[PDB]
């Protein structure tokens, strides 16, 4: 293939495997090192992402646009990072079929338009018409706690966070700003309200429709947007891999669930097994960050993509 | 075959049509750049891949200045220059190697050079200032999968706009100086809103906070502190801590280009001046003018590479628009004006002699290279597409048959709106056959002091 | 993935694909064998290459002997059987990566390999002996393009005669002896004729020119000499000088294959029996028969190689209407079947536990490969086409929809007269399922006495 | 530790390691080459090991063991190789920890004679009073099939066998003889009627006992006798990998369950799972069987421990 983007795919696609594994609520510590000795360890995706230095070109480009992501929003950084180097990984072999890469582009363009089409109704809605006592607060700690992951400290930030006034009618709140990320995600469940299926649900489902969208679209487009959704389905398979069983056998489960009009069923990971609804076990995801992870990993992945050579300058 | 100085020279422009090769078309690819240690640049810019790659050669540095007409008409139809030259290149060697003499080749490319623009200056089209919609795709055109992070169709309408405004009337040709316009640039993210202004916009913060923000029909003019200041506002302003006490009880700015001053003369020869805030800062807008050719564009982007494309794709725009209106002619893109160049050449050789006719032939190959380019680009199968084409065109209610990149099929380039302006083509053309005649014309390289 | 023991016969498979790949289909390309110092061979047959190239691997050698199904099927679908085989193997190898064990792969792949046999079961047309119509598409079919030095048309005709010739009925179920067949040949120039005889034809000149050139209702039967020539016509011949004379007073031969012994035997359990001039030589005809199920074809060509070309090709054709006959179904090639085959896997793959589902889908992909390879021989685009007819596929209409290697587009198969026997493409897809379970199945590789 | 010794048990563990694959009913195929080309393809450890070719004086003595155990039974070759390699592995740990390997032969004799004294007592017994009509002989089909793994020629095998003639008191019939190893079978299980739970049930409850008593013993012979139940424990886990699972989760499950006074569990190979009872699926071996398992790999493995060092003759 054309031995560039196949070069910057790979460096993509290695930086992407490195931060696999600090994935999800039981995600290994990274240790970092200054060039002073001094260390710091941890498994913030965000954290890693800032700090570390990469040499290569197109990691840095892919670096980036996770950088930018976690500044328009708090949450997903890894999730981008780690879905961008999916899409490369899942676009080599459409490459190496000879799929020339602008086509591969459209359909993963296509594939993304659609799956942001397609969130607000995988999702579901919350009571934004009032802070009402009735249960509309105590949900969000729910939440609070899954970004978390203590009978105390509950109240305090709840009241804290509502201290800050704002309405706005689209029910869109906006506030002038682990305990970082909790804020972040608190602001973006408020700041468009839905909610998403964590575990992976939402990959799934997304995947499920992309096929058959695919299907549709009916080119070589259908062949990577079959790619995107196969690419989509990688996270609850890791998040299968962080609990512990063989994580094919467990996608291949999801999958199946998700055609039955289960329609909803993800991976526990904490728990470490699937479950039925992860809604239930108040596994949330905003879908200001997913949206926001998609395109960003889509960006970076067609970004990549579409680099044909490297010249000297 | 000849002399390996010639073989050099060719095998150099060849090398940068390499260069730009992938990127030609709408949908075309990127090139990344790297520079020293320090930064890298991705781009989908014949002037700036050119301008940023090394050009320690005393061959092509010449070749990308023929390339950069020396005109008002100055474009990424850089890169169809380029290419083209490439192209005529490559298929010159294919004759040398039959020992045609590059005098007969030259030649040969010259009449080929003639017939073209002439076939060009017939198909073309009339458009004038008023047919927005033309225009409107001719903007659309220019920016054809540029990774630009503003909508296309929304950024294409700002373009005629802009270029509507700049617009004057010179002895029956208008006239659009594109120094008038204003280009400035900011990012964070709930960015990629692209912005129009009637005005100047100065980026900056003001310099104290307690100063009017708002200013009606400002004149602008832009103890010793005291004594100046008093001096100064006798009869805002633009370039200590003291004075901006005095000024605040007198707007300012602590730094703008100088770019920026002499867009303002112009603009102000000044009915508002505010200070609004974008996207998490504040910066100072000049709307109103004693001039009624000065705007300005804000282009603002979440990522930095995005929206430094989105200016130079902005600009080249503008240009096509601009040469559109002050030339008033336009042609179907998307291939069809280099099939029917090919036609009427392979018509016209036999009417020449036989070695020349050959060269003509050649320069008509030569020109259908940047069609199976373009299908290249966006994955299709060039051959397959060029014969279609080829073939379609024989009916002259076709000459507007172009290649659809999106689609796969030919289809007539002029309704689905792209659009392209003839000056430039034609220039290209020019650019092309003066770079590889020149390059054929030199025998030998010497040293000299 | 596992043990380098599975990835050496894995390879060693996909080497066997890669060595009959570029041959697949009508369009299909020759290979050049050298055999030591001595001779060379181009040829078209999956059966020739496999036995011409080295086999000097254990594995793989096994894998020729699965694809030549142990059966009286046994044709050209032998490249079926292997490139198949060599695609099951490659699409398993991105299953082991994912660390998918074996046991679970060749579950999945007797499922696929049991719903494949099932549609092609379901698909396939109703065909008797008195089909002419089909039975020389079937027979036009097998020679697609073979280097074949006779009229593909009239040849088709020929064996679809022969066939019918030698056609026996046994219990509601006709029978095709093709050991009835003689096949001999002949090259000079003014040649590239092919002949049909009902009968058998001896090539050998008269032993003696003094001699009856015809013999009517020759009754067979093929001092010390004299003897025995008057002991032997105590009741023409074949097998000295003195012998000729008595011959030549009381037809003979000096010297002929003991296959044509054979099947003069079986001929003759004798009307005429002359001696005819071909182009530049002479040789003897046997014509009539105390047999109605014997005949012999006569392929003479130019050059040599395209008359053994002929002779396989011939050969092969005989095999395949023989099949259609004998087993009365026939289906629509040119990919129908195959994409019919992955249509229903996929569709029945979820209703079969995950890790089988993938193998499953991987068994319909590894099929959908098989027509790609189509396409690629034909020179056309093999992704394009194949979701052009999985996509026309959609409709239970186009069931019979497949690739026109020559004009490149999706057409009905079996109006186009492209027709194959069922039962060998089913026995391909058990050989090619049966090489690789095995291949799959291995572990290691242990040394023995 | 000792060069030699060490030496040898890596040749005999390589060789068990080769073998293990080919263990159980889904066992994989071996591909065995004569020096002229000539190929058999077989899962059958007497076959692999009978006609296999081995260099290394050590894997050569394992292979006599095996086939001498292949001549006085015929089943159970595969079993006493993979056993064998497995006690040499284990004693490997032991060896490390500087302990003596005349010890380590100690504990392995120990823990074999405590085995073979608690196998009858593992087992059940059968009815050798009477072939009578009863299921009594239905019952040994069952097995009949169990070593075969067909509607027909059932009655005709067993009638075929009951021709010839031997009751003997102690119930031990004598007989003049994949059919081949049914007879041996049926044989085995009369010539000494017990059966045992196969699937490995036999060797975890052997293991579990064979702790107990190892904590008796006390001294180093302990850890020996621990290694010997831990290598004991390696076949269920084998049967387990060919049942696909990760083999060292259901070990622990099946142990678990030995412990409760489940006391039989044993794991379906071609079920694929694990089953509580091993006896209900007809999952069978005759004791003749394991015991020379037991005998034949503990005398290999004690063997190749006993040797010090290597001398040119």
Same mark, same amino acid.
């Given at each position: 293939? /054309?031995?560039?983007?196949?070069?910057?795919?790979?460096?993509?696609?290695?930086?992407?495997?490195?931060?696999?594994?600090?994935?999800?609520?039981?995600?290994?510590?990274?240790?970092?090192?200054?060039?002073?000795?001094?260390?710091?360890?941890?498994?913030?995706?965000?954290?890693?992402?800032?700090? #570390?230095?990469?040499?290569?070109?197109?990691? =840095?480009?892919?670096?980036?646009?996770?950088?930018?992501?976690?500044?328009?929003?708090?949450?997903?950084?890894?999730?981008?990072?780690?879905?961008?180097?999916?899409?490369?990984?899942?676009?080599?072999?459409?490459?190496?079929?000879?799929?020339?890469?602008?086509?591969?582009?459209?359909?993963? =363009?296509?594939?993304?338009?659609?799956?942001?089409?397609?969130?607000?109704?995988?999702?579901?809605?919350?009571?934004?018409?009032?802070?009402?006592?009735?249960?509309?607060?105590?949900?969000?700690?729910?939440?609070?706690?899954?970004?978390?992951?203590?009978?105390?400290?509950?109240? #305090?930030?709840?009241?804290?966070?509502?201290?800050?006034?704002?309405? $706005?009618?689209? *029910?869109?709140?906006?506030?002038? $700003?682990?305990?970082?990320?909790?804020?972040?995600?608190? /602001?973006?469940? $408020?700041? %468009?309200?839905?909610?998403?299926?964590?575990?992976?649900?939402?990959?799934?489902?997304?995947?499920?429709?992309? /096929?058959?969208?695919? /299907?549709?679209?009916?080119?070589? %487009?259908?062949?990577?947007?079959?790619?995107?959704?196969?690419?989509?389905?990688?996270?609850?398979?890791?998040?299968?891999?962080?609990?512990?069983? %063989?994580?094919?056998?467990?996608?291949?489960?999801?999958?199946?669930?998700?055609?039955?009009?289960?329609?909803?069923? *993800?991976?526990?990971?904490?728990?470490? =097994?699937?479950?039925?609804?992860?809604?239930? $076990?108040?596994?949330?995801?905003?879908?200001?960050?997913?949206?926001?992870?998609? =395109?960003?990993?889509?960006?970076?992945?067609?970004?990549?993509?579409?680099?044909?050579?490297?010249?000297?300058? | 075959? !000849?002399?390996?100085?010639?073989?050099?020279?060719?095998?150099?422009?060849?090398?940068?049509?390499?260069?730009?090769?992938?990127?030609? !078309?709408?949908?075309?690819?990127?090139?990344?750049?790297?520079?020293?240690?320090?930064? @890298?640049?991705?781009?989908?810019?014949?002037?700036?891949?050119?301008?940023?790659?090394?050009?320690?050669?005393?061959?092509?540095?010449?070749?990308?200045?023929?390339?950069?007409?020396?005109?008002?008409?100055?474009?990424?139809?850089?890169?169809?220059?380029?290419? &083209?030259?490439?192209?005529?290149?490559?298929?010159?060697?294919?004759?040398?190697?039959?020992?045609?003499?590059?005098?007969?080749?030259?030649?040969?490319?010259?009449?080929?050079?003639?017939?073209?623009?002439?076939?060009?200056?017939?198909?073309?089209?009339?458009?004038?200032?008023?047919?927005?919609?033309?225009?409107?795709?001719?903007?659309?055109?220019?920016?054809?999968?540029?990774?630009?992070?503003?909508?296309?169709?929304?950024?294409?309408?700002?373009?005629?706009?802009?270029?509507?405004?700049?617009?004057?009337?010179?002895?029956?040709?208008?006239?659009?100086?594109? +120094?008038?316009?204003?280009?400035v640039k900011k990012?964070?993210?709930?960015?990629? +809103?692209?912005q129009?202004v009637?005005?100047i916009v100065v980026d900056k913060e003001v310099?104290?906070?307690?100063?009017?923000?708002?200013?009606?029909?400002?004149? @602008?003019?832009?103890?010793?502190?005291?004594?100046?200041?008093?001096?100064?506002?006798?009869?805002?302003?633009?370039?200590?801590?003291?004075?901006?006490?005095?000024?605040?009880?007198?707007?300012?700015v602590?730094?703008a280009?100088?770019?920026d001053?002499?867009?303002?003369?112009?603009?102000?020869?000044?009915?508002?001046?505010e200070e609004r805030k974008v996207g998490e800062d504040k910066m100072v807008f000049v709307?109103?003018?004693?001039?009624?050719?000065?705007?300005?564009?804000l282009?603002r !982007?979440?990522?930095?590479?995005?929206?430094?494309?989105?200016?130079?794709?902005?600009? +080249?725009?503008?240009?096509?628009?601009?040469?559109?209106?002050?030339?008033?002619?336009?042609?179907?893109?998307?291939?069809?004006?280099?099939?029917?160049?090919?036609?009427?050449?392979?018509?016209?050789?036999?009417?020449?002699?036989?070695?020349?006719?050959?060269?003509?032939?050649?320069?008509?190959?030569?020109?259908?290279?940047?069609?199976?380019?373009?299908?290249?680009?966006?994955?299709?199968?060039?051959?397959?597409?060029?014969?279609?084409?080829?073939?379609?065109?024989?009916?002259?209610?076709?000459?507007?048959?172009? &290649?659809?990149?999106?689609?796969?099929?030919?289809?007539?380039?002029?309704?689905?709106?792209? @659009?392209?302006?003839?000056?430039?083509?034609?220039?290209?053309?020019?650019?092309?056959?003066?770079?590889?005649?020149?390059?054929?014309?030199?025998? +030998?390289?010497?040293?000299?002091?």
């Open positions: 293939g /054309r031995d560039a983007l196949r070069n910057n795919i790979l460096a993509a696609k290695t930086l992407a495997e490195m931060l696999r594994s600090s994935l999800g609520p039981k995600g290994l510590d990274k240790m970092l090192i200054d060039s002073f000795g001094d260390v710091t360890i941890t498994n913030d995706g965000a954290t890693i992402v800032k700090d #570390m230095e990469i040499q290569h070109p197109a990691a =840095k480009l892919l670096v980036e646009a996770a950088k930018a992501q976690d500044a328009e929003v708090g949450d997903g950084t890894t999730s981008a990072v780690v879905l961008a180097g999916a899409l490369l990984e899942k676009a080599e072999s459409l490459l190496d079929q000879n799929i020339h890469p602008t086509i591969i582009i459209e359909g993963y =363009k296509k594939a993304y338009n659609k799956a942001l089409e397609l969130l607000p109704q995988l999702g579901t809605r919350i009571d934004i018409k009032d802070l009402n006592s009735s249960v509309a607060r105590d949900t969000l700690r729910k939440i609070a706690f899954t970004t978390l992951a203590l009978n105390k400290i509950i109240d #305090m930030v709840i009241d804290a966070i509502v201290n800050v006034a704002e309405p $706005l009618p689209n *029910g869109g709140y906006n506030v002038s $700003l682990s305990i970082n990320d909790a804020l972040h995600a608190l /602001r973006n469940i $408020l700041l %468009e309200p839905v909610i998403l299926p964590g575990g992976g649900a939402i990959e799934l489902e997304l995947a499920m429709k992309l /096929r058959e969208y695919a /299907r549709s679209v009916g080119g070589k %487009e259908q062949l990577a947007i079959e790619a995107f959704a196969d690419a989509l389905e990688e996270i609850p398979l890791i998040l299968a891999e962080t609990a512990g069983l %063989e994580a094919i056998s467990s996608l291949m489960d999801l999958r199946a669930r998700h055609a039955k009009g289960l329609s909803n069923t *993800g991976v526990d990971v904490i728990g470490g =097994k699937i479950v039925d609804d992860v809604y239930a $076990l108040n596994i949330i995801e905003p879908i200001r960050v997913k949206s926001q992870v998609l =395109k960003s990993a889509t960006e970076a992945a067609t970004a990549i993509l579409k680099i044909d050579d490297l010249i000297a300058a | 075959y !000849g002399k390996e100085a010639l073989r050099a020279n060719i095998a150099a422009v060849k090398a940068i049509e390499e260069a730009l090769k992938s990127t030609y !078309g709408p949908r075309g690819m990127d090139k990344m750049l790297v520079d020293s240690l320090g930064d @890298i640049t991705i781009t989908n810019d014949g002037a700036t891949i050119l301008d940023k790659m090394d050009l320690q050669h005393p061959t092509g540095k010449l070749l990308v200045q023929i390339a950069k007409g020396q005109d008002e008409e100055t474009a990424d139809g850089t890169k169809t220059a380029v290419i &083209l030259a490439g192209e005529l290149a490559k298929k010159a060697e294919d004759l040398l190697y039959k020992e045609i003499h590059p005098t007969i080749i030259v030649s040969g490319y010259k009449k080929a050079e003639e017939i073209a623009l002439k076939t060009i200056q017939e198909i073309a089209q009339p458009v004038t200032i008023n047919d927005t919609d033309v225009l409107r795709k001719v903007a659309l055109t220019s920016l054809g999968s540029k990774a630009v992070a503003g909508a296309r169709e929304y950024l294409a309408d700002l373009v005629v706009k802009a270029v509507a405004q700049v617009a004057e009337l010179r002895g029956d040709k208008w006239y659009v100086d594109l +120094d008038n316009v204003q280009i990012h964070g993210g709930s960015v990629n +809103d692209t129009l009637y005005g310099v104290h906070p307690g100063m009017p923000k708002r200013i009606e029909n400002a004149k @602008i003019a832009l103890n010793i502190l005291k004594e100046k200041v008093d001096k100064i506002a006798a009869t805002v302003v633009i370039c200590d801590e003291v004075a901006q006490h005095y000024l605040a009880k007198k707007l300012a602590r730094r280009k100088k770019s001053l002499e867009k303002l003369a112009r603009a102000t020869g000044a009915a508002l001046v709307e109103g003018a004693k001039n009624p050719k000065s705007v300005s564009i282009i !982007g979440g990522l930095e590479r995005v929206v430094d494309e989105t200016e130079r794709a902005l600009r +080249d725009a503008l240009g096509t628009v601009a040469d559109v209106i002050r030339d008033g002619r336009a042609v179907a893109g998307g291939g069809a004006v280099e099939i029917e160049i090919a036609k009427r050449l392979r018509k016209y050789a036999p009417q020449v002699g036989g070695k020349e006719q050959l060269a003509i032939e050649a320069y008509a190959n030569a020109i259908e290279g940047l069609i199976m380019i373009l299908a290249e680009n966006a994955g299709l199968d060039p051959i397959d597409k060029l014969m279609q084409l080829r073939s379609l065109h024989e009916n002259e209610t076709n000459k507007w048959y172009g &290649l659809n990149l999106f689609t796969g099929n030919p289809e007539d380039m002029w309704k689905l709106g792209v @659009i392209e302006p003839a000056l430039v083509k034609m220039n290209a053309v020019k650019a092309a056959t003066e770079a590889v005649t020149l390059v054929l014309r030199i025998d +030998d390289i010497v040293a000299a002091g």
